[PDB]
Amino acid sequence: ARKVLDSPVKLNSSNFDETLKNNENVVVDFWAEWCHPCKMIAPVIEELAKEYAGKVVFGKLNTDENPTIAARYGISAIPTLIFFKKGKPVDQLVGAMPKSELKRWVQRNL
């Protein structure tokens, strides 16, 4: 059938902590419009968001627009992906990565 959320969703101060609290599995993509590697992986994240629709919520946290939230996790390079299980960070991926590696990363934590 069709899922409620099947694509990446914008996160900011109005829904970041709430999304983590109310969804068992969340992947947050920390990104910025000036980051070339971020743009390079965006299509892969979209595809995985469709593939794991209903299982994993893919959030996008713009680091320019939400510096405090990014600083909370010590984001020192982008793109950084963090896997949140039950609202807690349990794994991370830093820098652009192939889809195959990205998917295995999800499967390892989901």
Numbering used by the authors: 25 to 134
Please share excerpts from the published article on this structure.
Thioredoxins and thioredoxin-like proteins (glutaredoxins and protein disulfide isomerases) are prevalent in nature and found throughout all kingdoms of life. These disulfide/dithiol oxidoreductases function via their surface-exposed, redox-active disulfide bond.
As the names imply, the mutant AfTrx3HP has the active site sequence CHPC; AfTrx3PH has the sequence CPHC, and AfTrx3KP has the sequence CKPC. To ensure that AfTrx3 is a representative Trx, the crystal structure of AfTrx3HP was solved to 1.95 Å resolution. The AfTrx3HP mutant crystallized better than wild-type and thus was used to provide a structural depiction of this archaeal protein. Comparison with E. coli Trx in the region of the active site shows that the only major difference is in the sequence of the CXXC loop itself. In particular, the difference is due to the substitution of His (60 in this A. fulgidus mutant) with Gly (33 in E. coli). Indeed the disulfide is in a hydrophobic environment, blocked from direct contact with solvent by residues Trp 58, Pro 61, Ile 102, Pro 103.
